Each structure stands twice: as C-alpha cells, then as structure tokens.
Amino acid sequence: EGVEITFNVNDYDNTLTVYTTRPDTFMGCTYLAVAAGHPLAQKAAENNPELAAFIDECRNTKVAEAEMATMEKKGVDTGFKAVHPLTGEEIPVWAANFVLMEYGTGAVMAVPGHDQRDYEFASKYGLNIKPVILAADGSEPDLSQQALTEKGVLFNSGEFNGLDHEAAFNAIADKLTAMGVGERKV
Ligand code: MET
C-alpha cells in the first residue's frame, strides 16, 4: 500500500508521476529525482551537454538496486521545476543515477529530512532538507548530520501538523486523491 502522485512541470507538455509508500512525509518533499532514461531528463538533455554526458555515463553503469547503498550517488539539475501540489511551491527536478526505469515510473519524490539516500544526495548537491517529522521525544529532529528515519508526528506540514503516522498517511493520501492528483495502490 502506497500512492502514485502526479506533479505538473512548468514548460513541459507531460506530467511527472511518482510512487511512494510514505505519503506522510510528502510535505517534506524538496525535489524530484528522475531516471537518466526518463523522457523529462532527455527533453532537457536537448539543451544541456552536462546532462547529455551524464545520461551516457549512466547508460553504461548497470546500476542494480541492491548495489546502491554502495555506489557513489550522482546527478544533475535538469533545469525543469515541478510544482508541489499541496504546497504550491516549485521544487527542482534532478536526474540521478540511483533511479531506474525498469521498475516504477522512473521518478521518485525525495524527502531528505527522513530518507537517508535522499539526505546524502541533497547534502552533496546543496538541495533543501526539510524536517516534517518530530523526534520520538517530541522535539524537533536533529538534521545537522543525518536523516531522522523514524515514523512519527508531523510538523511544519501545514494542515497535517499534529497527525501521527497512520493518520498522516491517510489524511495526505485522501487529500491528493480528492484533488485528483494522487491514487492509492493496493
Ligand atoms: C522521507 S521517507 C519517504 C521518502 C522516499 N523517497 C519515498 O518515496 O518513500
């Protein structure tokens, strides 16, 4: 059980769609990551040689999911901005070597405040790291050095503040659904 979530992207005729099993952190989404082989990444490749090079470098490295906690994570800013549906604010779309086309939409929403892979990528590239879950003693999480990986009560999540994990999961899934922008999967 998770959700597909659809973002519009400024100056791009298609949409971006992401799967996650953690809609509860969705207010903490500070950027999107697409596979090198993804249509948006290659529409952008057209006016970007750094990305052309990166895409070719990736086409060589057969990155396997199980080998990923090991590999140097790498990526490039596509230039495209996506609009966060709940928030209204623009977030960068990056191409990343750790996102694949084979399984999934070839795109992922990232919450570096609460997923460690996400935290390492954002640390390395200067992307925003947003706390939305509280530590288990109900303090603000320490995000000076690593991601707070625990499930917990949301904060700094607007209308969703105060909700525990299961309540957040449903309240944010239901909202994205009522906005016709999200879909539960079984
Ligand atoms: C911060 S936990 C959720 C983030 C992760 N990228 C996911 O889509 O599940």
Side-chain angles (χ1 to χ4, degrees), residues 1-42 44-46 48-58 60-61 63-88 90-101 103-149 151-165 167-186:
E1 173 110 329
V3 177
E4 312 199 338
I5 309 179
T6 287
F7 300 76
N8 285 315
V9 179
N10 295 352
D11 318 326
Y12 176 75
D13 311 335
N14 239 295
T15 61
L16 260 187
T17 297
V18 173
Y19 184 63
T20 185
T21 59
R22 310 273 327 255
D24 53 299
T25 61
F26 188 55
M27 295 310 288
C29 182
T30 53
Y31 68 93
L32 299 181
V34 306
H38 186 282
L40 164 316
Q42 73 202 17
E46 284 177 11
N48 194 164
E50 215 206 316
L51 234 192
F54 179 78
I55 282 161
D56 295 291
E57 268 166 55
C58 284
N60 274 333
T61 311
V63 217
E65 268 280 356
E67 290 308 84
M68 271 187 204
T70 250
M71 55 152 222
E72 179 59 333
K73 289 188 293 322
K74 301 229 244 269
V76 171
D77 187 342
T78 63
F80 290 111
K81 305 287 182 228
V83 168
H84 191 301
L86 299 182
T87 225
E90 304 184 302
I91 58 173
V93 178
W94 280 60
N97 60 172
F98 62 82
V99 179
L100 312 166
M101 275 321 292
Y103 283 98
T105 57
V108 313
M109 55 130 288
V111 179
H114 307 289
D115 165 294
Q116 191 54 29
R117 183 167 87 170
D118 290 344
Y119 187 101
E120 291 158 8
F121 191 82
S123 289
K124 164 164 191 186
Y125 292 109
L127 305 166
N128 297 332
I129 296 176
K130 207 180 151 192
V132 286
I133 300 182
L134 296 157
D137 64 336
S139 50
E140 294 192 350
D142 187 30
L143 300 179
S144 50
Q145 282 157 347
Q146 56 154 243
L148 189 112
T149 244
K151 287 147 194 262
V153 173
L154 318 203
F155 83 115
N156 193 213
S157 284
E159 89 175 58
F160 300 109
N161 287 349
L163 299 172
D164 60 282
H165 175 246
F169 186 106
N170 297 326
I172 308 200
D174 290 346
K175 186 121 173 181
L176 291 165
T177 281
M179 281 175 44
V181 132
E183 184 162 290
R184 281 182 201 248
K185 296 299 207 157
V186 180

mmCIF file of all heavy atoms in Angstrom, residues 11-48, unseen atoms left out:
data_model
loop_
_atom_site.group_PDB
_atom_site.id
_atom_site.type_symbol
_atom_site.label_atom_id
_atom_site.label_comp_id
_atom_site.label_asym_id
_atom_site.label_seq_id
_atom_site.Cartn_x
_atom_site.Cartn_y
_atom_site.Cartn_z
ATOM 1 N N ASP A 11 6.684 24.482 -18.279
ATOM 2 C CA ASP A 11 7.364 24.454 -19.593
ATOM 3 C C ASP A 11 7.677 23.059 -20.083
ATOM 4 O O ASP A 11 8.732 22.831 -20.682
ATOM 5 C CB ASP A 11 8.644 25.305 -19.600
ATOM 6 C CG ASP A 11 8.466 26.634 -18.890
ATOM 7 O OD1 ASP A 11 7.351 27.205 -18.949
ATOM 8 O OD2 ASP A 11 9.379 27.183 -18.240
ATOM 9 N N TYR A 12 6.754 22.136 -19.831
ATOM 10 C CA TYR A 12 6.912 20.715 -20.173
ATOM 11 C C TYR A 12 5.507 20.124 -20.393
ATOM 12 O O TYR A 12 4.672 20.216 -19.502
ATOM 13 C CB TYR A 12 7.710 19.997 -19.068
ATOM 14 C CG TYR A 12 7.868 18.504 -19.239
ATOM 15 C CD1 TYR A 12 8.763 17.971 -20.179
ATOM 16 C CD2 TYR A 12 7.117 17.613 -18.468
ATOM 17 C CE1 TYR A 12 8.907 16.574 -20.344
ATOM 18 C CE2 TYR A 12 7.257 16.206 -18.620
ATOM 19 C CZ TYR A 12 8.153 15.700 -19.558
ATOM 20 O OH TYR A 12 8.288 14.335 -19.717
ATOM 21 N N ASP A 13 5.243 19.561 -21.585
ATOM 22 C CA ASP A 13 3.864 19.182 -22.014
ATOM 23 C C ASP A 13 3.237 18.000 -21.284
ATOM 24 O O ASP A 13 2.002 17.855 -21.268
ATOM 25 C CB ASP A 13 3.790 18.835 -23.504
ATOM 26 C CG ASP A 13 4.449 19.854 -24.371
ATOM 27 O OD1 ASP A 13 4.552 21.031 -23.927
ATOM 28 O OD2 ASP A 13 4.897 19.553 -25.512
ATOM 29 N N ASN A 14 4.096 17.141 -20.737
ATOM 30 C CA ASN A 14 3.677 15.993 -19.954
ATOM 31 C C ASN A 14 3.582 16.345 -18.461
ATOM 32 O O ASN A 14 3.756 17.512 -18.063
ATOM 33 C CB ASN A 14 4.678 14.861 -20.171
ATOM 34 C CG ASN A 14 4.045 13.620 -20.729
ATOM 35 O OD1 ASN A 14 3.214 12.985 -20.071
ATOM 36 N ND2 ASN A 14 4.443 13.244 -21.947
ATOM 37 N N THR A 15 3.293 15.333 -17.642
ATOM 38 C CA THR A 15 3.375 15.464 -16.197
ATOM 39 C C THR A 15 4.508 14.564 -15.683
ATOM 40 O O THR A 15 5.147 13.865 -16.486
ATOM 41 C CB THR A 15 2.040 15.069 -15.539
ATOM 42 O OG1 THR A 15 1.751 13.704 -15.838
ATOM 43 C CG2 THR A 15 0.875 15.822 -16.142
ATOM 44 N N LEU A 16 4.770 14.597 -14.371
ATOM 45 C CA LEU A 16 5.680 13.647 -13.744
ATOM 46 C C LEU A 16 4.883 12.865 -12.760
ATOM 47 O O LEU A 16 4.106 13.441 -12.025
ATOM 48 C CB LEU A 16 6.794 14.345 -12.968
ATOM 49 C CG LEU A 16 8.171 14.487 -13.588
ATOM 50 C CD1 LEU A 16 9.163 15.046 -12.571
ATOM 51 C CD2 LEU A 16 8.650 13.197 -14.191
ATOM 52 N N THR A 17 5.089 11.565 -12.714
ATOM 53 C CA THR A 17 4.364 10.751 -11.769
ATOM 54 C C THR A 17 5.321 9.972 -10.887
ATOM 55 O O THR A 17 6.309 9.438 -11.367
ATOM 56 C CB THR A 17 3.372 9.837 -12.508
ATOM 57 O OG1 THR A 17 2.409 10.662 -13.189
ATOM 58 C CG2 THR A 17 2.508 9.030 -11.512
ATOM 59 N N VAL A 18 5.026 9.920 -9.590
ATOM 60 C CA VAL A 18 5.891 9.253 -8.628
ATOM 61 C C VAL A 18 5.104 8.228 -7.785
ATOM 62 O O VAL A 18 3.902 8.392 -7.512
ATOM 63 C CB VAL A 18 6.581 10.291 -7.686
ATOM 64 C CG1 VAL A 18 7.332 9.584 -6.607
ATOM 65 C CG2 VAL A 18 7.528 11.214 -8.461
ATOM 66 N N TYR A 19 5.786 7.159 -7.395
ATOM 67 C CA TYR A 19 5.237 6.236 -6.437
ATOM 68 C C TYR A 19 5.930 6.432 -5.094
ATOM 69 O O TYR A 19 7.152 6.623 -5.047
ATOM 70 C CB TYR A 19 5.408 4.790 -6.914
ATOM 71 C CG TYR A 19 4.763 3.820 -5.980
ATOM 72 C CD1 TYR A 19 3.389 3.842 -5.780
ATOM 73 C CD2 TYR A 19 5.517 2.907 -5.257
ATOM 74 C CE1 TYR A 19 2.768 2.975 -4.898
ATOM 75 C CE2 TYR A 19 4.899 2.016 -4.359
ATOM 76 C CZ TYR A 19 3.522 2.073 -4.191
ATOM 77 O OH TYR A 19 2.873 1.226 -3.326
ATOM 78 N N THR A 20 5.166 6.405 -4.007
ATOM 79 C CA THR A 20 5.780 6.339 -2.676
ATOM 80 C C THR A 20 4.937 5.544 -1.727
ATOM 81 O O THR A 20 3.723 5.444 -1.945
ATOM 82 C CB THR A 20 6.008 7.752 -2.109
ATOM 83 O OG1 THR A 20 6.708 7.663 -0.855
ATOM 84 C CG2 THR A 20 4.641 8.470 -1.796
ATOM 85 N N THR A 21 5.555 5.010 -0.671
ATOM 86 C CA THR A 21 4.858 4.253 0.376
ATOM 87 C C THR A 21 4.846 5.100 1.644
ATOM 88 O O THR A 21 4.475 4.619 2.736
ATOM 89 C CB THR A 21 5.589 2.938 0.673
ATOM 90 O OG1 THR A 21 6.948 3.205 1.104
ATOM 91 C CG2 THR A 21 5.782 2.096 -0.613
ATOM 92 N N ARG A 22 5.285 6.360 1.488
ATOM 93 C CA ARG A 22 5.333 7.306 2.571
ATOM 94 C C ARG A 22 4.738 8.678 2.180
ATOM 95 O O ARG A 22 5.441 9.699 2.217
ATOM 96 C CB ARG A 22 6.769 7.440 3.119
ATOM 97 C CG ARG A 22 7.433 6.112 3.431
ATOM 98 C CD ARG A 22 7.152 5.586 4.809
ATOM 99 N NE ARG A 22 6.987 6.663 5.805
ATOM 100 C CZ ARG A 22 7.900 6.985 6.727
ATOM 101 N NH1 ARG A 22 9.061 6.344 6.770
ATOM 102 N NH2 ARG A 22 7.664 7.966 7.585
ATOM 103 N N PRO A 23 3.439 8.708 1.828
ATOM 104 C CA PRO A 23 2.738 9.977 1.638
ATOM 105 C C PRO A 23 2.803 10.868 2.871
ATOM 106 O O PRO A 23 2.677 12.086 2.741
ATOM 107 C CB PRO A 23 1.296 9.564 1.369
ATOM 108 C CG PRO A 23 1.236 8.146 1.773
ATOM 109 C CD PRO A 23 2.581 7.565 1.501
ATOM 110 N N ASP A 24 3.019 10.290 4.039
ATOM 111 C CA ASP A 24 3.010 11.075 5.255
ATOM 112 C C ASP A 24 4.156 12.102 5.263
ATOM 113 O O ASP A 24 4.041 13.141 5.918
ATOM 114 C CB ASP A 24 3.103 10.165 6.478
ATOM 115 C CG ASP A 24 4.278 9.220 6.406
ATOM 116 O OD1 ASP A 24 4.345 8.380 5.470
ATOM 117 O OD2 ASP A 24 5.193 9.238 7.250
ATOM 118 N N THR A 25 5.260 11.811 4.568
ATOM 119 C CA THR A 25 6.382 12.775 4.535
ATOM 120 C C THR A 25 6.271 13.787 3.392
ATOM 121 O O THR A 25 7.079 14.703 3.264
ATOM 122 C CB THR A 25 7.724 12.055 4.464
ATOM 123 O OG1 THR A 25 7.768 11.290 3.260
ATOM 124 C CG2 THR A 25 7.834 10.962 5.583
ATOM 125 N N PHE A 26 5.232 13.644 2.591
ATOM 126 C CA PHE A 26 5.096 14.400 1.368
ATOM 127 C C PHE A 26 5.258 15.909 1.486
ATOM 128 O O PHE A 26 5.571 16.574 0.477
ATOM 129 C CB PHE A 26 3.748 14.091 0.710
ATOM 130 C CG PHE A 26 3.624 14.680 -0.626
ATOM 131 C CD1 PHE A 26 4.590 14.396 -1.607
ATOM 132 C CD2 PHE A 26 2.629 15.603 -0.903
ATOM 133 C CE1 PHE A 26 4.528 14.988 -2.879
ATOM 134 C CE2 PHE A 26 2.550 16.190 -2.190
ATOM 135 C CZ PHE A 26 3.499 15.880 -3.171
ATOM 136 N N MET A 27 5.044 16.468 2.685
ATOM 137 C CA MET A 27 5.189 17.926 2.880
ATOM 138 C C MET A 27 6.650 18.272 2.978
ATOM 139 O O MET A 27 7.030 19.438 2.902
ATOM 140 C CB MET A 27 4.479 18.426 4.149
ATOM 141 C CG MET A 27 2.936 18.288 4.123
ATOM 142 S SD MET A 27 2.180 18.948 2.614
ATOM 143 C CE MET A 27 2.329 20.773 2.783
ATOM 144 N N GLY A 28 7.463 17.235 3.185
ATOM 145 C CA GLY A 28 8.897 17.361 3.280
ATOM 146 C C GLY A 28 9.581 17.149 1.953
ATOM 147 O O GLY A 28 10.805 17.198 1.911
ATOM 148 N N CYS A 29 8.803 16.932 0.883
ATOM 149 C CA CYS A 29 9.379 16.751 -0.443
ATOM 150 C C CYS A 29 10.006 18.050 -0.949
ATOM 151 O O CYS A 29 9.283 19.037 -1.170
ATOM 152 C CB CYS A 29 8.320 16.323 -1.439
ATOM 153 S SG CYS A 29 9.041 16.052 -3.072
ATOM 154 N N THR A 30 11.333 18.064 -1.110
ATOM 155 C CA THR A 30 12.028 19.290 -1.533
ATOM 156 C C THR A 30 12.641 19.257 -2.929
ATOM 157 O O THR A 30 13.234 20.261 -3.348
ATOM 158 C CB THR A 30 13.134 19.677 -0.573
ATOM 159 O OG1 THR A 30 13.986 18.547 -0.388
ATOM 160 C CG2 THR A 30 12.577 20.005 0.804
ATOM 161 N N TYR A 31 12.528 18.117 -3.618
ATOM 162 C CA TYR A 31 12.952 17.970 -5.013
ATOM 163 C C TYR A 31 12.491 16.640 -5.582
ATOM 164 O O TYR A 31 12.066 15.731 -4.832
ATOM 165 C CB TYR A 31 14.470 18.148 -5.183
ATOM 166 C CG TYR A 31 15.289 17.056 -4.566
ATOM 167 C CD1 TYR A 31 15.680 15.955 -5.312
ATOM 168 C CD2 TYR A 31 15.668 17.116 -3.211
ATOM 169 C CE1 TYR A 31 16.428 14.931 -4.739
ATOM 170 C CE2 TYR A 31 16.434 16.096 -2.635
ATOM 171 C CZ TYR A 31 16.804 15.007 -3.403
ATOM 172 O OH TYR A 31 17.538 13.995 -2.835
ATOM 173 N N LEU A 32 12.548 16.526 -6.911
ATOM 174 C CA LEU A 32 12.163 15.276 -7.570
ATOM 175 C C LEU A 32 13.371 14.714 -8.248
ATOM 176 O O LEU A 32 14.235 15.487 -8.690
ATOM 177 C CB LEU A 32 10.995 15.474 -8.551
ATOM 178 C CG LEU A 32 9.633 15.981 -8.021
ATOM 179 C CD1 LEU A 32 8.556 16.093 -9.116
ATOM 180 C CD2 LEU A 32 9.053 15.177 -6.862
ATOM 181 N N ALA A 33 13.461 13.380 -8.297
ATOM 182 C CA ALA A 33 14.568 12.695 -8.972
ATOM 183 C C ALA A 33 14.054 11.734 -10.046
ATOM 184 O O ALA A 33 13.194 10.873 -9.786
ATOM 185 C CB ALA A 33 15.464 11.963 -7.971
ATOM 186 N N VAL A 34 14.582 11.892 -11.261
ATOM 187 C CA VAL A 34 14.170 11.083 -12.413
ATOM 188 C C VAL A 34 15.327 10.230 -12.925
ATOM 189 O O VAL A 34 16.510 10.600 -12.786
ATOM 190 C CB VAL A 34 13.514 11.937 -13.548
ATOM 191 C CG1 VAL A 34 12.358 12.756 -12.979
ATOM 192 C CG2 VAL A 34 14.509 12.878 -14.216
ATOM 193 N N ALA A 35 14.978 9.060 -13.464
ATOM 194 C CA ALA A 35 15.959 8.215 -14.093
ATOM 195 C C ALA A 35 16.597 8.913 -15.314
ATOM 196 O O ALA A 35 15.948 9.699 -16.030
ATOM 197 C CB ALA A 35 15.340 6.906 -14.484
ATOM 198 N N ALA A 36 17.879 8.617 -15.533
ATOM 199 C CA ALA A 36 18.597 9.078 -16.719
ATOM 200 C C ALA A 36 17.838 8.765 -18.018
ATOM 201 O O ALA A 36 17.832 9.583 -18.948
ATOM 202 C CB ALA A 36 20.000 8.475 -16.762
ATOM 203 N N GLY A 37 17.198 7.596 -18.082
ATOM 204 C CA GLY A 37 16.432 7.211 -19.261
ATOM 205 C C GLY A 37 15.025 7.795 -19.335
ATOM 206 O O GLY A 37 14.232 7.365 -20.172
ATOM 207 N N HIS A 38 14.702 8.754 -18.472
ATOM 208 C CA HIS A 38 13.333 9.268 -18.366
ATOM 209 C C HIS A 38 13.107 10.365 -19.374
ATOM 210 O O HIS A 38 13.979 11.218 -19.558
ATOM 211 C CB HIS A 38 13.056 9.791 -16.940
ATOM 212 C CG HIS A 38 11.634 10.197 -16.702
ATOM 213 N ND1 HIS A 38 11.118 11.394 -17.150
ATOM 214 C CD2 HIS A 38 10.617 9.564 -16.074
ATOM 215 C CE1 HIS A 38 9.846 11.481 -16.808
ATOM 216 N NE2 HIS A 38 9.519 10.386 -16.149
ATOM 217 N N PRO A 39 11.942 10.360 -20.014
ATOM 218 C CA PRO A 39 11.580 11.382 -21.017
ATOM 219 C C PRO A 39 11.872 12.849 -20.659
ATOM 220 O O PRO A 39 12.264 13.602 -21.560
ATOM 221 C CB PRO A 39 10.071 11.158 -21.215
ATOM 222 C CG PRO A 39 9.895 9.686 -20.990
ATOM 223 C CD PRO A 39 10.884 9.336 -19.884
ATOM 224 N N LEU A 40 11.675 13.240 -19.401
ATOM 225 C CA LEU A 40 11.895 14.617 -18.945
ATOM 226 C C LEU A 40 13.388 14.872 -18.932
ATOM 227 O O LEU A 40 13.850 15.937 -19.332
ATOM 228 C CB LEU A 40 11.264 14.817 -17.556
ATOM 229 C CG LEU A 40 11.452 15.912 -16.473
ATOM 230 C CD1 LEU A 40 12.897 16.367 -16.164
ATOM 231 C CD2 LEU A 40 10.566 17.096 -16.712
ATOM 232 N N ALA A 41 14.151 13.879 -18.494
ATOM 233 C CA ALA A 41 15.592 14.017 -18.477
ATOM 234 C C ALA A 41 16.143 14.184 -19.894
ATOM 235 O O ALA A 41 17.099 14.933 -20.095
ATOM 236 C CB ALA A 41 16.241 12.846 -17.775
ATOM 237 N N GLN A 42 15.545 13.503 -20.873
ATOM 238 C CA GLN A 42 16.021 13.628 -22.244
ATOM 239 C C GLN A 42 15.439 14.825 -23.011
ATOM 240 O O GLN A 42 16.131 15.391 -23.857
ATOM 241 C CB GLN A 42 15.933 12.319 -23.020
ATOM 242 C CG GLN A 42 14.575 11.892 -23.417
ATOM 243 C CD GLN A 42 14.525 10.403 -23.675
ATOM 244 O OE1 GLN A 42 15.432 9.664 -23.259
ATOM 245 N NE2 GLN A 42 13.469 9.951 -24.363
ATOM 246 N N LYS A 43 14.217 15.251 -22.698
ATOM 247 C CA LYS A 43 13.773 16.549 -23.200
ATOM 248 C C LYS A 43 14.717 17.677 -22.771
ATOM 249 O O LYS A 43 14.885 18.655 -23.486
ATOM 250 C CB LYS A 43 12.335 16.855 -22.789
ATOM 251 N N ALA A 44 15.342 17.532 -21.607
ATOM 252 C CA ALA A 44 16.223 18.573 -21.067
ATOM 253 C C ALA A 44 17.620 18.394 -21.603
ATOM 254 O O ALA A 44 18.332 19.375 -21.813
ATOM 255 C CB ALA A 44 16.237 18.567 -19.542
ATOM 256 N N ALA A 45 18.007 17.138 -21.809
ATOM 257 C CA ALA A 45 19.276 16.785 -22.448
ATOM 258 C C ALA A 45 19.504 17.563 -23.755
ATOM 259 O O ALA A 45 20.645 17.908 -24.091
ATOM 260 C CB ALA A 45 19.350 15.275 -22.705
ATOM 261 N N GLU A 46 18.410 17.840 -24.466
ATOM 262 C CA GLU A 46 18.416 18.580 -25.734
ATOM 263 C C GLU A 46 19.161 19.913 -25.687
ATOM 264 O O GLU A 46 19.830 20.269 -26.655
ATOM 265 C CB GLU A 46 16.983 18.843 -26.211
ATOM 266 C CG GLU A 46 16.272 17.643 -26.830
ATOM 267 C CD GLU A 46 14.833 17.951 -27.210
ATOM 268 O OE1 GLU A 46 14.426 19.140 -27.204
ATOM 269 O OE2 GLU A 46 14.098 16.992 -27.512
ATOM 270 N N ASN A 47 19.039 20.653 -24.592
ATOM 271 C CA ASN A 47 19.736 21.930 -24.487
ATOM 272 C C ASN A 47 20.736 21.925 -23.330
ATOM 273 O O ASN A 47 20.979 22.976 -22.728
ATOM 274 C CB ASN A 47 18.731 23.096 -24.369
ATOM 275 N N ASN A 48 21.324 20.749 -23.043
ATOM 276 C CA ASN A 48 22.251 20.552 -21.900
ATOM 277 C C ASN A 48 23.296 19.427 -22.065
ATOM 278 O O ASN A 48 22.988 18.246 -21.867
ATOM 279 C CB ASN A 48 21.465 20.327 -20.606
ATOM 280 C CG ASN A 48 22.321 20.460 -19.351
ATOM 281 O OD1 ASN A 48 21.781 20.598 -18.249
ATOM 282 N ND2 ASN A 48 23.645 20.415 -19.503
#
